Ligand binder design. Structure first.
Ligand code: ZN
Lengths: 112, 66, 56, 56, 27, 96, 103, 313, 111, 43, 49
């Protein structure tokens, strides 16, 4: 579990790595992720609690990155649900690879 | 200093929404029915916006109407 | 394919896409057997995907 | 586990806000979710099972 | 009276189909 | 009280007036013409022109693409900016 | 760090602020409160404090409708909540209450 | 009436042409029935084959909505004017603008050509109208006068050369060489949006939301009052056959006997396939040279062509 | 004799739209006789236009139907102008002709 | 029966609304591409 | 005479009720309404020019 949570948290930290003064919400995100390093078991239990219960989340921001040809959707979530979802993802992919869920023909693959 | 603006703004907002609330010879806010003292008028107002403050006005309402 | 979609005027070659980046000798030739084999392929694939699910 | 499923799904149902606008997404999947990848690849596995057919 | 105009005081300045039942119960 | 100020735009240009000529369609011709006959015959001609012009043993699904002949959605013009087919195409193209 | 429990003072001041400034200006309302952001103020308005929200017991019809719909569109609370006229969190709590008291 | 007067055949809708993206505000027809032109909110001017109804040519160059379009008779020009402020002269020999007439302070609502002299007359929101020397691009005269936006202006050869009306509900008749008013008529209660001069009679008509008045020439004695159809009416147009057409903002069109005010037909026309019911009504309309076709410019972004019904009686 | 220009075009179009509606309807709607809701009808105009920008259906409980069909007409016109402009600008940026700091962000917001 | 949002008609056919007698044609583009003259000069 | 006061006698000004009231008919045509003539127009046009 610690392995997974660590990976996901690093991933989240990687978007802000250049780190200008950012903003308020982003500040909340860095402080909360930073919190997750100090007391991991807390974060893991809170996460599993969400996954067992909450069916209603908060509103996601949306904005368009401009490639000058086709626009790219961009979504913004509150940090709590981002850490929760992130761990959910590292875990899902891990179990998935262990159990050989995806046959080889699907190739945005880690190997190559 | 930004903190000073909030004190000013939260007094005026509790003046708008405001007949019982006042300010004593000191700066504190007070409910003259309930004789309670309030740290901030808005904090005081909530007590002023509470259901106990409501009652004690009605009780004094009856107590005068008798 | 020709059973459900006939082409008496050989119009299957009108809207077929080739890759024009390449030189002519490298670019794909246009022939009835070949083109129609192509559209027959693409059509056969498409009919395996219900439109409400996804499409091509 | 059914719980994980109900979490993942229930997440794709939320409110999209841009300045003035608010609406509910009851249908399309949200790409920007952290775990959206796994949904995409799995669903894609399903439609693959459609295209190739189970035997092949 | 008819040409009374509601003041434009500014704020700036749902049904469902039954097919969902058939589907869901089917699954 | 007229100012001695000038401007670039104002200066002479096209000082000659192009009068219509006889084959361009001088008013003389126009007065004489029977338009109605001309308009009818042209119309008829146009109409005529138009007339001249015209295994897998295993699968989920039997053919979806049976009678699906495109439909006249691009023949309909719609006076509604958000439901014009042009707008749909634009919206389709530029958002992801 | 900003997150925390909601206070009667913050909540009443939120009432007054929303009354004065209007629904679409959140940054202005978050400016007056301490330890709370604009997103939190908005979602706190529309989730709970909003007077149009219905706080009371569920009638029999609302329970029939809620159960039927929840069996129709599993796990989708933001789609169902407007149909029954209740808050998503509220109808959630009531649903887990119906399965909780049902056995 | 005189005696259940002048039987005219009804008209039917013949053809509908799409292909503007904005409201079509203006239709004009070329001197030889070859091509008819349209100005639009699209900012284009399009020229259409009268016969087939196919689009010949799209011009671009106005910055804003084109409001008014005239094809000169004696020279191969278009004139157009817009909400932009700009009145342009296009040489149809090259399909480009050769001159531009500068000086109104706001949108120019309307324009017209003197039939023999070679002078252009324009109306603007700024409450003036101007007489422009086509050749030198020069404000010959400025017609001060009305208190609101001047809407429709017509030009004639004989006496009162310039007939104009405005949103201030009063018509002034302008003596061209003086650039002063000879006659003020004040008999409409609401804005005068359209006027029209009768081909042969030496009379003229004006339309307002309330009703439509004919006038004697000069000096505008009152003559008749056609009452019937009440809308904000944008178009009045007349055949040599004495057929007067009234367009309107609510979509309605009525045909009138010029002589009597007998309103023989009422046409309410379907809005376009998409559209909305509210985007109905005809901004303007015109008659080909043969008097055999009526063309209308509509807010549903179409052009409709009406044809006189041959079985009629 | 100031000349329409890029800096002034959006302002120009809305200026002459406010004037278009004003002249048309106050010369069209009337019999208030005193002043009929000119400030107010225009505030209904801007209100409706914002509502269509937010994609919020806009229904005023009381109102004359000619006023409502009015606003819906002109609002749809301005919507057609704004939208067509948006398409065109995305075509220019796609081809990479225009380099401007503002039209990119604006055009983005539009799409 | 069911219609995907891919199609889903809004508004009747163009032709239907006007009726049969009138001809409704949608001109888009144009013909006689511009280098052509409306009004061709004398020679 | 009030209204004229500023102007010369020559310049016209409507004021009486009679002016307002309608006058009828005038027939299919009468010499009364007609476009000055060719020749008057030529004179006017030339002097103007
Ligand atoms: Zn108290």
């Amino acid at each position: 579990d610690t392995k997974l949570l660590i990976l996901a948290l690093e991933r989240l930290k990687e978007a802000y790595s250049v780190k200008s003064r950012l903003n308020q919400s982003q500040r909340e995100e860095l402080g909360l992720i930073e919190q997750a390093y100090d007391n991991p078991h807390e974060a893991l239990s809170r996460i599993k609690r969400h996954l067992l219960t909450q069916r209603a989340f908060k509103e996601v921001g949306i904005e368009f990155m401009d490639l000058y040809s086709h626009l790219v959707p961009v979504y913004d979530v509150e940090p709590l649900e981002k850490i929760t979802d992130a761990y959910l993802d590292q875990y899902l992919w891990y179990e998935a690879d262990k159990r050989r869920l995806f046959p080889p023909w699907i190739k945005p693959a880690d190997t190559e | 200093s930004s903190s000073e603006s909030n004190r000013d703004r939260r007094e005026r907002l509790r003046q708008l929404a405001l007949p019982y609330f006042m300010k004593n010879h000191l700066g504190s806010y007070e409910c003259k029915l309930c004789l309670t003292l309030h740290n901030n008028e808005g904090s005081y107002l909530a007590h002023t916006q509470g259901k106990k403050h409501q009652t004690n006005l009605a009780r004094r309402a009856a107590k005068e109407a008798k | 394919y020709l059973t459900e979609h006939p082409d008496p005027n050989n119009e299957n070659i009108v809207g077929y896409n080739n890759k024009k980046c390449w030189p002519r000798d490298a670019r794909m030739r246009l022939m009835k057997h070949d083109v129609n084999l192509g559209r027959a392929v693409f059509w056969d694939i498409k009919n395996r995907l219900p439109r409400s699910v996804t499409t091509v | 586990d059914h719980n994980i499923a109900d979490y993942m799904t229930a997440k794709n149902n939320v409110v999209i806000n841009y300045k003035d606008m608010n609406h509910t997404n009851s249908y399309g999947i949200i790409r920007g979710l952290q775990f959206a990848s796994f949904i995409v690849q799995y669903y894609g596995l399903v439609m693959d099972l459609l295209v190739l057919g189970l035997h092949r | 009276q008819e040409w009374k105009i509601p003041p434009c005081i500014s704020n700036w300045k749902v049904h469902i189909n039954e097919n969902f039942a058939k589907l869901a119960e089917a699954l | 009280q007229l100012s001695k100020q000038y401007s670039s735009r104002d200066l002479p240009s096209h000082t000659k007036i192009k009068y219509r000529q006889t084959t361009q369609d001088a008013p003389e011709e126009v007065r004489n013409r029977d338009f109605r006959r001309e308009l009818e015959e042209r119309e008829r001609a146009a109409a005529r022109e138009k007339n001249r012009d015209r295994w897998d043993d295993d699968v989920v699904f039997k053919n979806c693409a049976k009678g699906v002949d495109d439909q006249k959605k691009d023949k309909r013009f719609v006076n509604d900016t958000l439901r014009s087919e042009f707008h749909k195409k634009f919206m389709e193209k530029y958002i992801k | 760090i900003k997150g925390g429990v909601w206070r009667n003072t913050e909540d009443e001041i939120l009432k007054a602020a929303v009354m004065k400034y209007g629904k679409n200006q959140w940054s202005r309302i978050a400016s007056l409160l301490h330890r709370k952001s604009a997103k939190q103020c908005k979602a706190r308005w529309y989730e709970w404090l909003d007077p149009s929200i219905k706080k009371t017991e569920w009638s029999r019809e609302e329970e029939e409708k809620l159960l039927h719909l929840a069996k129709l569109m599993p796990t989708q609370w933001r789609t169902i909540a407007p149909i029954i006229g209740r808050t998503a969190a509220q109808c959630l709590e009531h649903y887990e209450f119906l399965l909780d008291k049902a056995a | 009436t005189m005696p259940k007067p002048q039987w005219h055949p009804p008209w039917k809708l013949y053809r509908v042409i799409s292909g503007h993206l904005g409201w079509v505000r203006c239709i004009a027809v070329e001197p030889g029935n070859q091509w008819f032109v349209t100005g639009s909110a699209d900012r284009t001017i399009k020229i259409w084959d009268l016969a087939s109804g196919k689009l010949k040519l799209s011009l671009t160059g106005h910055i804003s909505t084109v409001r008014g379009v005239i094809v000169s008779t004696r020279s191969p020009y278009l004139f157009s004017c817009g909400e932009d402020k700009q009145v342009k002269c296009w040489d149809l020999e090259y399909n480009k603008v050769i001159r531009h007439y500068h000086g109104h302070l706001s949108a120019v609502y309307g324009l017209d050509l003197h039939p023999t002299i070679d002078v252009l007359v324009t109306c603007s929101r700024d409450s003036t109208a101007r007489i422009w020397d086509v050749r030198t691009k020069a404000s010959v005269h400025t017609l001060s006068g009305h208190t609101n936006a001047v809407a429709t202006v017509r030009c004639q050869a004989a006496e009162p050369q310039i007939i104009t009306g405005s949103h201030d509900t009063t018509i002034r008749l302008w003596d061209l060489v003086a650039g002063k008013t000879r006659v003020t008529l004040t008999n409409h209660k609401k804005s005068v949006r359209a006027v029209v001069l009768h081909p042969r009679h030496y009379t003229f008509a004006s339309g307002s939301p309330d009703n439509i008045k004919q006038w004697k020439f000069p000096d505008g004695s009152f003559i008749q009052n056609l009452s019937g159809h009440n809308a904000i009416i944008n178009t009045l147009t007349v055949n040599s056959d004495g057929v007067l057409v009234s367009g309107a903002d609510n979509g309605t069109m009525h045909l009138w006997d010029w002589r009597t005010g007998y309103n023989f037909q009422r046409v309410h026309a379907a809005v376009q396939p998409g559209s909305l019911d509210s985007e109905s009504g005809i901004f303007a309309c015109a008659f080909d040279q043969s008097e055999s076709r009526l063309l209308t410019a509509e807010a549903d972004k179409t052009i409709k062509v009406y044809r006189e019904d041959d079985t009629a009686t | 004799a100031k000349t329409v220009t890029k800096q002034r075009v959006e302002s120009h179009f809305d200026l002459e739209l406010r004037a278009a509606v004003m002249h048309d309807i106050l010369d069209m709607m009337p019999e208030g006789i005193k002043q009929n809701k000119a400030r107010t009808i225009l505030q209904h105009l801007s209100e409706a236009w914002r509502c269509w920008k937010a994609n919020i259906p806009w229904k005023v409980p009381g109102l004359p139907t000619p006023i409502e069909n009015m606003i819906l007409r002109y609002v749809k016109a301005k919507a057609d102008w704004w939208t067509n402009t948006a398409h065109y600008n995305r075509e220019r940026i796609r081809r990479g002709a225009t380099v401007d700091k503002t039209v990119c962000k604006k055009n983005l917001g539009r799409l | 029966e069911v219609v995907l949002h891919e199609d889903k008609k809004y508004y009747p056919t163009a032709e239907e609304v006007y009726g049969p007698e009138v001809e409704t044609i949608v001109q888009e583009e144009d013909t006689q591409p511009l280098t052509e003259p409306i009004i061709k000069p004398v020679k | 005479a009030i209204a004229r006061q500023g102007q010369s006698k020559d310049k016209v000004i409507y004021s009486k009720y009679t002016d307002l009231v309608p006058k009828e008919v005038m027939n299919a045509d009468d010499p009364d309404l007609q476009r000055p003539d060719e020749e008057a127009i030529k004179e006017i046009t030339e002097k103007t020019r």
